[PDB]
Amino acid sequence: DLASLAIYSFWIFLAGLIYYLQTENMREGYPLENEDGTPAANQGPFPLPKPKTFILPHGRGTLTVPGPESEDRPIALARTAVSEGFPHAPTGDPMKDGVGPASWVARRDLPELDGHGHNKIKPMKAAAGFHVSAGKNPIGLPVRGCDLEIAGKVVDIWVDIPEQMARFLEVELKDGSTRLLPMQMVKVQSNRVHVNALSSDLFAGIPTIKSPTEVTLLEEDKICGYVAGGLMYAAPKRKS
Amino acid sequence: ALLSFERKYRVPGGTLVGGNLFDFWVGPFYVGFFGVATFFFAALGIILIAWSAVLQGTWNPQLISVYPPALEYGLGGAPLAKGGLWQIITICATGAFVSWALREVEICRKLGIGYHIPFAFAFAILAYLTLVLFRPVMMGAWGYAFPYGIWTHLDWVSNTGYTYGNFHYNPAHMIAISFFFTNALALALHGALVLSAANPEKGKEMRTPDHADTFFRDLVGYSIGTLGIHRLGLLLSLSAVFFSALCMIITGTIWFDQWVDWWQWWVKLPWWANIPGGING
Amino acid sequence: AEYQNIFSQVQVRGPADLGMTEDVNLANRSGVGPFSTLLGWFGNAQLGPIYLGSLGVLSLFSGLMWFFTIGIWFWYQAGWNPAVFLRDLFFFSLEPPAPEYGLSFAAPLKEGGLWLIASFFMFVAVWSWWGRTYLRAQALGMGKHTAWAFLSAIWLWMVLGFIRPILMGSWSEAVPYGIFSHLDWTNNFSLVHGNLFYNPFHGLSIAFLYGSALLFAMHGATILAVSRFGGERELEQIADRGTAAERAALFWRWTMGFNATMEGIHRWAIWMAVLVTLTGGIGILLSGTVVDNWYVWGQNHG
Ligand code: BCL
Ligand code: BCL
Ligand SMILES: CC[C@H]1c2cc3[nH]c4c(c3C)C(=O)[C@H](C(=O)OC)c4c3nc(cc4[nH]c(cc(n2)[C@@H]1C)c(C(C)=O)c4C)[C@@H](C)[C@@H]3CCC(=O)OC/C=C(\C)CCC[C@@H](C)CCC[C@H](C)CCCC(C)C
Ligand SMILES: CC[C@H]1c2cc3[nH]c4c(c3C)C(=O)[C@H](C(=O)OC)c4c3nc(cc4[nH]c(cc(n2)[C@@H]1C)c(C(C)=O)c4C)[C@@H](C)[C@@H]3CCC(=O)OC/C=C(\C)CCC[C@H](C)CCC[C@H](C)CCCC(C)C
Ligand SMILES: COC(C)(C)C(=O)C/C=C(\C)CC/C=C(\C)CC/C=C(\C)CCCC/C(C)=C/CC[C@H](C)CC/C=C(\C)CCC=C(C)C
Ligand SMILES: CCCCCCCCCCCC[N+](C)(C)[O-]
Ligand SMILES: CCCCCCCCCCCC[N+](C)(C)[O-]
Ligand SMILES: CCCCCCCCCCCC[N+](C)(C)[O-]
Ligand SMILES: CCCCCCCCCCCC[N+](C)(C)[O-]
Ligand SMILES: [Fe+3]
């Protein structure tokens, strides 16, 4: 009957749909590889989808996926076993090298632009009309590291103009240079800003930005990467 | 075996239990100590379930059903064929679930991300525990739990419901449903919004998030923003399930009568209780 | 602990954002509204502006007419007494015409006519608002996802109070406007068709509802888990994969064996939610037109 028809029909629809859904999520990081980077033998039942090209807004070109994948940075890792499936140990300083939970991707070295073609993110001193409308204004508060020692001070808030959101705290170190600190990895308190991931001694290692009034996708990744990695690698310095 | 960008992430560490012992992968999958735990609990449970199936004398999945002990057994142990098997199976499920959560924690650490996912999952686990542990205890027999079978479980739902009248009147049930509906609504729009920006009109340049925000400001006069909608989603979801637990944990424990009748409180407020006319006067 | 990013710990405000102006008729957009610091702790603090336009007004006017036409009926039931009105608010009900009138538009007002007026108003309210979702997108050059997603919802509503009442031969088969009454109608609709738990569309529909919660839980917690790498900025991540997208995909690959991309995850999303009322609509449509009792149907499959 009709009902039987409809339901049998639907289970068929649903199956080609999953198939679709699945092949679309195969647009990045495919095809699969062996730990040595050579193409892996068994890529699953699903074919790579036919490429699609994204036309990017501020004459920043196009992007076609799937496409040629490459890390575009040397990875400081060495195998710890003779068969597949085991960890790869950092061969240096994982933090300094950017592997592990400290990994960063070679994003473009251009900043994210707003709908108008202006830099999406800006230090608040250069954002004409912006102010802390609520909560504790961090600016001026010391930054304390997980080792419970002061590392610097808050000399500005880099805001996301389009979302009116605080993205990073710009911290001044003992030598007078500054670093960005992701907003998402610090606790603003009444008398201090506490950073659990980094011990005071690692703040200097936080990668620097080439221009003082801009951050690029590459530098966001290298920074967030680094600060995140502290959680696992600063661990010996963290007390509480 | 690895995604084109996976290797630099596959470093040692992050394990909660047992150091480097189980710190490794199997194909795409991460094992970890709890990798093993869940496997063991999952193996055992499925076994017991098959064992129930022979005692039942059917291999047909639409028929197979593992029932809790009958009320006469209260919160004591029961013979295998008479409810023990369900009790173990329930222990094993719990073991599986919790372990699966703790593995999520272990992966979280290795990758250096937040614990929001293990977190949210614990709500699912807590809803399940409400229906097979917290409610039966409080009620006083494993027998109030739902049976493990594809349709028999739908039956428990239907019977348990109709016991208190039309269950629609359970007030926390009303609230819990509003989230389920609301969440789906919000998943619908969020998915649609991002896609429409990323996949515009033919030959056009990729929209920007700013366009996304404008689109909603144009539509209903407010946009929660990109960070917002993700906070929103997590919340509606967790809330739906939170109220779902609540509506059950109260049902049969502190309220055992017809749910519709509980509304008489409102209608019988002394200031309008006796005023004639309307529906109730 | 650590900071979780469920609530902002510092609010930052600037000049009111009047937005992208693409092909939008700026004449129609309103003025910026105030800013809720309340809202600001969760998401955006800025209210407005909003776009009015012809369809917005028609929609918005029919919308109120519907609501009011029901409202006066409730008052008439309450004996115009504000006390009763409050006491009995969820008990009042605007019911469709009796089965006697069939698909007739001649039912007396106290006997079903008023229901038709209200519906007619709603029908109009809803479709215009649909066209509104479409146009608003067109004027910004965006995909029409939202309008199509919306159409799914519309499907179930169309079926409940219009398509099914018409295929059954009478308006009496439609849903009454009322809080407790539309609950009862639902509960009763299942009883009559032999328990909707045997309607496999109903069962499918529940799977996608449950799933929507499962997914929006998964997606939300994930994006929050990697916002420490600017995960929330999904469009740029799509355009240029960041570590955020990577950690996201990998956490999931390592847990359950496969994974999404940032554009990908949102396709999972729109389809999981859209299938709820899509399947739903179908389950209800066959209910009572082709299948009288899902249990009997369940025994044979035919
Ligand atoms: C929480 C609310 C009620 C209840 C009310 C209903 C109602 C009402 C319905 C279901 C439906 C279903 N229920 Mg139930 N269900 C409950 C508790 C459970 C439990 C549990 C351990 O707590 C589980 C595992 C299930 C599982 C299921 C599926 C068989 C089915 C589709 C659900 C879905 O899409 O979810 C979304 C999740 C996903 C898409 C992720 C993938 C889920 C897959 C499908 C899981 C299948 C597991 C199953 C085959 C058993 C495996 C166990 C062993 C390892 C073999 N229910 C409680 C008692 N359930 C619907 C149905 O059609 O089944 C008859 C239906 O109509
Ligand atoms: C006793 C009750 C019966 C039963 C009878 C029914 C009936 C009858 C129906 C459902 C339906 C549904 N049931 Mg059932 N159901 C039962 C038990 C359950 C259980 C359970 C036991 O755990 C669950 C989980 C469900 C779950 C569900 C949903 C999956 C499904 C509706 C999805 C939806 O989101 O629509 C919500 C979305 C809409 C209604 C879309 C409307 C969109 C419109 C356009 C909104 C306009 C707004 C308006 C103009 C006002 C404006 C707003 C103001 C400005 C604020 N049922 C039992 C067996 N169920 C529906 C279905 O699809 O079944 C197949 C349905 O018709
Ligand atoms: C795919 C399935 C899900 C879905 C999707 C969906 N719904 C949608 C969309 C989509 C994709 C839209 O684009 C569209 C939308 O614009 O949302 C922002 C819509 C929408 N879904 C809505 C509601 C809705 N969707 C629902 C369900 C669902 N929608 C599904 C679960 C439900 C239910 C019953 O679960 C409801 C109630 C609307 C918010 C919006 C469609 C708006 C519309 O058509 O308006 C027409 C008429 C008016 C302008 C009426 C206004 C009259 C009011 C002023 C009266 C009430 C006054 C009241 C006392 C006010 C106070 C409220 C307080 C909280 C402050
Ligand atoms: C809290 C909000 C919602 C939510 C969230 C949620 N679910 C989650 C997560 C999150 C955040 C995960 O991270 C985790 C996941 O990895 O998803 C891919 C998970 C998950 N949610 C799942 C299912 C699921 N979630 C559901 C619900 C929900 N999940 C909510 C609505 C439902 C239902 C019925 O609504 C189901 C069916 C899994 C796909 C996955 C967890 C997988 C897992 O725990 O693996 C460990 C266990 C096994 C491999 C099998 C164990 C076998 C048992 C020992 C025996 C079988 C016993 C069982 C009781 C029989 C039941 C029979 C039925 C017919 C009744
Ligand atoms: C404060 O008092 C005043 C008077 C000021 C008020 O305004 C108060 C007002 C309230 C008390 C209002 C309360 C309103 C509610 C309780 C409403 C509840 C509504 C629901 C629960 C609706 C549920 C389901 C509705 C459904 C499925 C409607 C479907 C409608 C349609 C598909 C439309 C079909 C079209 C029809 C039959 C006519 C078509 C005619 C043509 C010519 C095309
Ligand atoms: C996480 C534990 C879940 C267990 C589910 C039910 C187990 C019942 C345990 C009772 C065993 C014996 N008793 C009555 C003497 O306590
Ligand atoms: C978006 C893809 C995920 C879809 C989930 C498919 C599994 C649902 C199984 C429901 C069982 C249903 N049925 C028809 C017997 O009632
Ligand atoms: C519904 C769950 C689907 C998970 C898919 C997992 C893909 C695994 C690919 C094969 C890897 C094989 N193995 C375990 C033999 O090494
Ligand atoms: C109901 C949800 C079911 C999810 C559908 C299962 C998809 C499995 C995809 C496995 C992909 C294998 N691969 C390529 C990663 O090895
Ligand atoms: Fe998202």
Side-chain angles (χ1 to χ4, degrees), chain C residues 9-293:
Chain C
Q9 47 177 335
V10 179
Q11 279 210 43
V12 175
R13 182 173 308 162
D17 196 308
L18 299 162
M20 308 305 315
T21 300
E22 292 299 323
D23 286 343
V24 173
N25 173 349
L26 293 176
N28 284 318
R29 280 226 252 268
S30 87
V32 176
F35 287 57
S36 177
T37 300
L38 181 64
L39 278 191
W41 294 114
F42 212 49
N44 274 198
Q46 181 177 310
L47 291 177
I50 180 147
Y51 190 110
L52 291 186
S54 323
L55 236 64
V57 185
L58 178 78
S59 187
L60 190 59
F61 170 73
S62 320
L64 293 180
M65 277 334 259
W66 171 67
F67 192 74
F68 283 138
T69 294
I70 281 149
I72 73 152
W73 177 251
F74 279 26
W75 280 101
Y76 159 69
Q77 280 194 337
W80 304 97
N81 192 327
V84 165
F85 182 87
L86 261 59
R87 191 200 43 206
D88 292 354
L89 184 63
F90 293 174
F91 297 94
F92 302 138
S93 188
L94 177 61
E95 314 261 337
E100 273 80 72
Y101 298 90
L103 290 177
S104 185
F105 276 94
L109 293 182
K110 291 182 180 180
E111 295 291 327
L114 202 45
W115 180 93
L116 291 179
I117 297 167
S119 324
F120 171 78
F121 273 158
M122 197 180 201
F123 185 88
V124 175
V126 173
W127 277 114
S128 46
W129 187 270
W130 180 67
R132 180 139 183 293
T133 64
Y134 187 108
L135 293 176
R136 258 45 268 148
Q138 185 179 69
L140 287 165
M142 303 174 113
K144 260 95 237 167
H145 298 63
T146 289
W148 297 124
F150 188 33
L151 190 58
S152 231
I154 277 161
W155 167 235
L156 181 54
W157 160 81
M158 272 312 267
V159 168
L160 278 171
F162 191 71
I163 307 177
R164 199 194 165 260
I166 275 156
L167 291 178
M168 288 298 287
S170 67
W171 298 121
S172 59
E173 285 284 322
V175 181
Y177 302 110
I179 297 302
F180 280 172
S181 78
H182 99 296
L183 290 192
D184 289 349
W185 177 90
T186 291
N187 161 68
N188 185 203
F189 181 96
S190 171
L191 288 182
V192 167
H193 290 95
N195 179 3
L196 243 48
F197 276 174
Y198 294 115
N199 189 321
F201 294 113
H202 185 248
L204 237 6
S205 196
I206 279 160
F208 293 131
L209 192 75
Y210 282 178
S212 283
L214 168 44
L215 190 62
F216 215 158
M218 282 175 55
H219 188 36
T222 306
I223 290 311
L224 287 181
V226 292
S227 55
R228 56 190 50 186
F229 315 106
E232 60 262 40
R233 292 149 66 185
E234 308 192 299
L235 287 185
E236 202 58 10
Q237 285 278 335
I238 284 176
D240 197 16
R241 195 184 62 239
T243 173
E246 292 195 351
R247 292 178 196 235
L250 287 181
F251 166 93
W252 283 116
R253 183 159 195 268
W254 291 358
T255 299
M256 77 193 200
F258 69 120
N259 66 265
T261 58
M262 206 85 58
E263 202 200 346
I265 194 30
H266 291 99
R267 303 204 175 271
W268 275 107
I270 193 200
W271 274 116
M272 177 76 73
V274 143
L275 284 188
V276 164
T277 58
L278 186 55
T279 313
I282 297 176
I284 299 301
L285 190 62
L286 300 169
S287 277
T289 54
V290 169
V291 178
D292 242 273
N293 173 318

Side-chain angles (χ1 to χ4, degrees), chain A residues 29-30 32-33 35 40 52 54-55 57 69 71 73 77 79 85 87-88 100-101 103 114-115 162-163 232-233, chain B residues 1-5 7-13 23-25 109-112 198-199 205-206 208 210 213 226-227:
Chain A
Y30 279 79
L32 306 166
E33 293 168 10
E35 300 179 354
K52 84 184 293 201
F54 289 107
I55 297 175
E69 302 266 317
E71 285 294 86
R73 44 160 308 200
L77 293 175
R79 230 169 182 217
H88 302 259
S103 287
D114 78 7
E163 291 191 43
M232 170 176 303
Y233 300 122
Chain B
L2 307 215
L3 287 172
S4 74
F5 51 84
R7 185 172 194 209
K8 75 182 168 279
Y9 291 107
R10 287 207 179 192
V11 292
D23 189 26
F24 56 86
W25 285 260
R109 282 153 75 85
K110 195 182 287 288
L111 286 170
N199 297 271
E205 305 166 337
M206 258 186 87
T208 60
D210 308 335
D213 273 344
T226 188
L227 183 59

Side-chain angles (χ1 to χ4, degrees), chain A residues 15 33 43 52 63 81 95 159 173:
Chain A
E33 293 168 10
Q43 307 271 345
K52 84 184 293 201
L63 165 65
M95 298 284 261
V159 317
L173 299 175

Side-chain angles (χ1 to χ4, degrees), chain A residues 41-63:
Chain A
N42 328 113
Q43 307 271 345
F46 302 93
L48 272 180
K50 290 178 177 180
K52 84 184 293 201
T53 299
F54 289 107
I55 297 175
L56 320 184
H58 314 325
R60 281 209 160 162
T62 63
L63 165 65

Side-chain angles (χ1 to χ4, degrees), chain A residues 214-230:
Chain A
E214 280 183 349
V215 245
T216 55
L217 299 170
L218 181 78
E219 305 177 315
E220 287 197 62
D221 241 46
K222 283 181 181 180
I223 293 173
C224 298
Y226 182 89
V227 176

